[PDB]
Amino acid sequence: DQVKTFLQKISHTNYIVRDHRVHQIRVLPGVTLIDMLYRLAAGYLGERPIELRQIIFKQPVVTSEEFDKHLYVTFTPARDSWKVEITSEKAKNGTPLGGNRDENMECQLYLQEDAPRAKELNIEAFMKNASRKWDMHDIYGIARRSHIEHGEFMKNEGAVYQLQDKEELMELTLSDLAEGFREKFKAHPAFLDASTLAGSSFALPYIPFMIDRFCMYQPFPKTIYTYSAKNSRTESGVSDSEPDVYSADFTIYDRAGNVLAECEKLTVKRVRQANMITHLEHHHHH
Numbered sequence: 464d465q466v467k468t469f470l471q472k473i474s475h476t477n478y479i480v481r482d483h484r485v486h487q488i489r490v491l492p493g494v495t496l497i498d499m500l501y502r503l504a505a506g507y508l509g510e511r512p513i514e515l516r517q518i519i520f521k522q523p524v525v526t527s528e529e530f531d532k533h534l535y536v537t538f539t540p541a542r543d544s545w546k547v548e549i550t551s552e553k554a555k556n557g558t559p560l561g562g563n564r565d566e567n568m569e570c571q572l573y574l575q576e577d578a579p580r581a582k583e584l585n586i587e588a589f590m591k592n593a594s595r596k597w598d599m600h601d602i603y604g605i606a607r608r609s610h611i612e613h614g615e616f617m618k619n620e621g622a623v624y625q626l627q628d629k630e631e632l633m634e635l636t637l638s639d640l641a642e643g644f645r646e647k648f649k650a651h652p653a654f655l656d657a658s659t660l661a662g663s664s665f666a667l668p669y670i671p672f673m674i675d676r677f678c679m680y681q682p683f684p685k686t687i688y689t690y691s692a693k694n695s696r697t698e699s700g701v702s703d704s705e706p707d708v709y710s711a712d713f714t715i716y717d718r719a720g721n722v723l724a725e726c727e728k729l730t731v732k733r734v735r736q737a738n739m740i741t742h743l744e745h746h747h748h749h
Contacts, residue, residue, distance in 0.1 A: 475526040482614025491524030501649035514678035522565040525746035583720035595625040619657040633689040661691035661713040675728035688716040
């Protein structure tokens with residue numbers, strides 16, 4: 464235990480980027496990296512359950528016909544924990560190109576030893592005593608009109624329930640294609656991505672940007688239930704019609720009401736279209 468850099472490959476043909484494009488450019492969801500860390504940890508620590516804290520998402524992983532990407536995950540020993548950083552580089556036909564390295568993400572990895580703090584929930588009762596409901600395609604309408612396009616593998620099926628304007632529950636299921644990989648992941652990126660959409664009904668381009676804590680307690684089943692509460696949401700200046708940042712907590716349930724995952728304070732940042740266009744097109748250019 465100390466320092467250990469691991470190599471991961473994100474190719475242009477990877478189903479994630481294929482089915483996640485922003486302004487017609489293939490990018491890597493920032494939350495996707497949460498799965499990567501969990502897969503790699505299992506190898507570098509032992510399989511010992513672990514969580515993540517102080518996550519920062521920082522340069523999008525973009526692919527092209529012209530280039531794939533190689534990612535470098537580096538575990539560095541630290542204070543009763545490990546620091547983790549992910550960088551990346553252009554590659555082609557299996558070989559990196561030797562250019563500049565982008566920083567993609569950082570966090571602090573701790574050993575998990577504490578039980579979930581989020582009390583179970585009666586899924587059935589929430590749904591039946593649901594107050595408002597939206598299809599699992601109108602919620603995505605927000606991404607679409609912000610020029611984000613989910614394809615087969617990344618687009619979840621289901622519906623969003625709202626209770627008194629105060630709580631939300633997202634019934635999510637993978638596409639059959641996506642479903643075939645659900646056990647190959649530690650946390651399916653499709654599930655993770657869609658879950659960052661928690662709280663969308665409250666208030667019906669905001670990009671993930673920091674996470675105070677994320678923790679997997681159990682592997683995802685075929686359908687999950689992402690719960691989110693209004694009282695856990697805060698935002699810049701309190702009462703902004705167009706906030707700069709806002710942030711919330713979500714909990715992922717199974718169906719029997721067990722805690723599968725916890726996310727504390729997912730902070731997201733709205734982006735100017737024009738800034739994002741410049742940004743992604745710079746990334747796309749070789």
